[PDB]
Design a protein around this nucleic acid. Structure first.
Ligand code: MN
Ligand code: MN
Ligand code: MN
Ligand code: MN
Ligand code: MN
Ligand code: MN
Ligand code: MN
Ligand code: NA
Length: 326
DNA sequence: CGGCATACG
DNA sequence: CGTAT
DNA sequence: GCCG
């Protein structure tokens, strides 16, 4: 009926159970804030199952037989179906712990562990953090300074402009190098939190050394508000009407031999890639990452020329990016 | 009961 | 520890 | 939290 792994089923960007999945993703997020990766995963997977359904869930019986729905996620849905709200979800929403961990972890440079420590120290607001900047990393100082712009959704119109400037710098750093839009925008999102790009070159090995050359050129054009190799987590200065705004941009380089694996990995979703790697290992005995796919019996790597190759080597029906919105 | 994706900066 | 999908 |  409904397969158990998210990589076994199309998941479109918009769907027929938005309210139910949003509620389960609250509980998933809260689990993460408490360090319960297992519960986070189950709530994420249950949410994604609903995203993959062809019509709205209207009755509790429609959950029977759906993978990843047990006592807890079913009770959440039952309450939403009966009352329009789930008391547990609402308790989380308005809890000081949830609101503060959400606020802190959304800072670039701050993870659950840092947020939790700050919470235990009594800190609650961004200005609480600004008062004692001696305890911040440079990365967190950047995330905090730019927090307001970074909280503003990036639009598809912003993306085309950014891509043009990235290509200009990439073309100077290495003629022939290519830039591919990845992440959520490649899955069809109309807005996002950041922009993800994958860079390669058709001649294996020519991409070596490329990212520092790209970064130096962007920085010389005055476009880099912050940066820290093959992955660069930047804050770009993006022109705006009569001004500009800070935007998070990720630049990644891969040799062309690895490009299909890095495209697949950086196109996501996060849950899709976790499920795909889990499927690969547990069902097929193969080890998948954004560099390659390894058979640990033969001790060999699978050559891929396309994402389609990778799906085929895993025995999965091909899913375009717009159906990977798990 | 063990497992829960797998990297890089 | 942070970051990424 | 759920699965196999
Ligand atoms: Mn429970
Ligand atoms: Mn009731
Ligand atoms: Mn992204
Ligand atoms: Mn990103
Ligand atoms: Mn590498
Ligand atoms: Mn256990
Ligand atoms: Mn993301
Ligand atoms: Na963060």
């Amino acid at each position: 009926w409904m397969p158990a792994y998210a990589c076994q089923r199309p998941t479109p960007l918009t769907h027929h159970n938005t309210g139910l999945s949003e509620a389960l993703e609250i509980l998933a997020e809260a689990a993460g804030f408490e360090g319960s990766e297992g519960r986070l995963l189950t709530f994420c997977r249950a949410a994604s199952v609903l995203k993959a359904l062809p019509s709205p869930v209207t009755t509790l019986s429609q959950l029977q037989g759906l993978p990843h729905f047990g006592e807890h996620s079913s009770r959440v849905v039952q309450e939403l179906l009966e009352h329009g709200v789930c008391e547990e979800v609402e308790r989380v929403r308005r809890s000081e712990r949830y609101q503060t961990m959400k606020l802190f972890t959304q800072i670039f440079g701050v993870g659950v562990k840092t947020a939790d420590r700050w919470y235990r120290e009594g800190l609650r607001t961004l200005d609480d953090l600004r008062e004692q900047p001696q305890k911040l990393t440079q990365q967190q100082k950047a995330g905090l300074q730019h927090h307001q712009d970074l909280s503003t959704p990036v639009l598809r119109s912003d993306v085309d402009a950014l891509q043009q400037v990235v290509e200009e710098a990439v073309g100077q750093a290495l003629p022939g190098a290519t830039v591919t839009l990845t992440g959520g925008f490649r899955r069809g999102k109309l807005q996002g939190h950041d922009v993800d790009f994958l860079i390669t070159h058709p001649k294996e090995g020519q991409e070596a050394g490329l990212l520092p050359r790209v970064m130096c050129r962007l920085q010389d054009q005055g476009l880099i508000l912050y940066h820290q190799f093959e992955r660069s987590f930047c804050i770009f200065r993006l022109p705006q009407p009569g001004s500009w705004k800070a935007v998070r941009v990720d630049l990644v380089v891969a040799p062309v031999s690895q490009f299909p694996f890095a495209l697949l990995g950086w196109t996501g979703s996060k849950l899709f890639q976790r499920e795909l790697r889990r499927f690969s290992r547990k069902e097929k005995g193969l080890w998948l990452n954004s560099h390659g796919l390894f058979d640990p019996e033969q001790k060999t790597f699978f050559q891929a020329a396309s994402e389609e190759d990778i799906f085929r080597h895993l025995g999965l029906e091909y899913l375009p990016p717009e159906q990977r919105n798990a």
